Amino acid sequence: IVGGTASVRGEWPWQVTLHTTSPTQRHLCGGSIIGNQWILTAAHCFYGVESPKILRVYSGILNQSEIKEDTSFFGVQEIIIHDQYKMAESGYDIALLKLETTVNYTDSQRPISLPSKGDRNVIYTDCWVTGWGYRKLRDKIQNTLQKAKIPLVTNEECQKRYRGHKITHKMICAGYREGGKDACKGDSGGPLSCKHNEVWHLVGITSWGEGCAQRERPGVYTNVVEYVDWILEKTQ
């Protein structure tokens, strides 16, 4: 998170830290709790992941320093990548982690709803991007969970900044015209959560963009509402 501030415990309870344990154990990507044994993340996070054996999902984590050799975690039973996925910049950057056990919901770990059936025309004015990612292009993974309010930009406006990319209706962009606040390396997979009528919705999944928080270069996200049918087909 570029231009963000620290979160407090139980602020983003659907946020998870997916770790890899090969060749070293570290924060790989972010994710969202969308069900008792379901995590919604981005497919590109599993590039070079040979099997779910090396992964660990940590929920209820504020600082990465809280993760010790005795810290509880969830094993991943299955990694469901979108069948159409190839590269992040081209879309379908959506994956589902099916955990080995159910999540007991508390204040530090609860599920986030997907955009509602009938809220397609909603103008989201309170969107937030969260994660433990970099604060600049050549940085390191953060300790506390950063947050950033980012305005959504239209598909047409976003397509102007990305003349060399195909910005589809399965993508949503968020950024400030003069840069400053954005998600960077380590934030992918995580949520772009927008609050509407005091309910949080998982509106996007952190995906890609030219550099981190550059001017007139919005963050590109997976448009969750478009994939709700895929998610329901898989989580049933």
Ligand SMILES: O=C(O)Cc1ccccc1OCc1cccc(-c2ccc3c(c2)CNCC3)c1
């Ligand atoms: O993809 C990750 O987060 C971490 C990761 C996992 C697996 C393989 C590669 C990899 O890192 C690639 C990498 C390198 C530098 C910056 C980014 C990055 C990430 C997100 C966003 C932006 C940029 C621009 N702003 C909008 C959001 C990604």
